Design a binder for this molecule. Sequence first.
Ligand code: WNB
Length: 133
Amino acid sequence: HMCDAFVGTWKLVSSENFDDYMKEVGVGFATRKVAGMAKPNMIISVNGDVITIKSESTFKNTEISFILGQEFDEVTADDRKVKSTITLDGGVLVHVQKWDGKSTTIKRKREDDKLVVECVMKGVTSTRVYERA
Ligand SMILES: O=C(O)[C@H]1C[C@@H]1c1cc2ccccc2n1Cc1cccc(Cl)c1
C-alpha cells in the first residue's frame, strides 16, 4: 500500500503554465479561461485494487476509477473522450491519455506535504500543486 501516500482530500494552491498546456491539448478560449480559474478539490481513495480520483470544482466535476495497468475510458474536464492507462513507476502515478491520434501524460507525485501534478503535451509542461484540504 505505497499508494497510501496519495489518499486523502487535496485542494489546488498553485498552477504554472497551465494555459499553455491546455492550448497544446486543444482546449478552446472560453474553456481555458473558466477552467483556469478553478481551484478544484481532489479526493483520492483506494479500495482493494481500485483507485478512485475525484475532482470537484466550480467548473466541472470529474471522476475516474481504475486498476493500475488496465486501460479505461475517461471523460476529461474539457470533454475529451480518451483512453487512459495509469501505472505506478517508482512511486509516481503515470497517467497516459490517448485520443484522436494524440497523447498527453499526467504525473502525480508526493513531495513534502504536497501533491504535485505535472501535465505534459509535446514540449509543454505545467505544474499544479495541491495541499491537504
Ligand atoms: O488534476 C489536475 O490538476 C489536472 C489534471 C487535470 C486537468 C487536465 C485538464 C485538461 C484540460 C482542462 C483542464 C484540465 N485539468 C484541470 C482541471 C481544471 C478545472 C476543473 C477540473 Cl475538474 C480539472
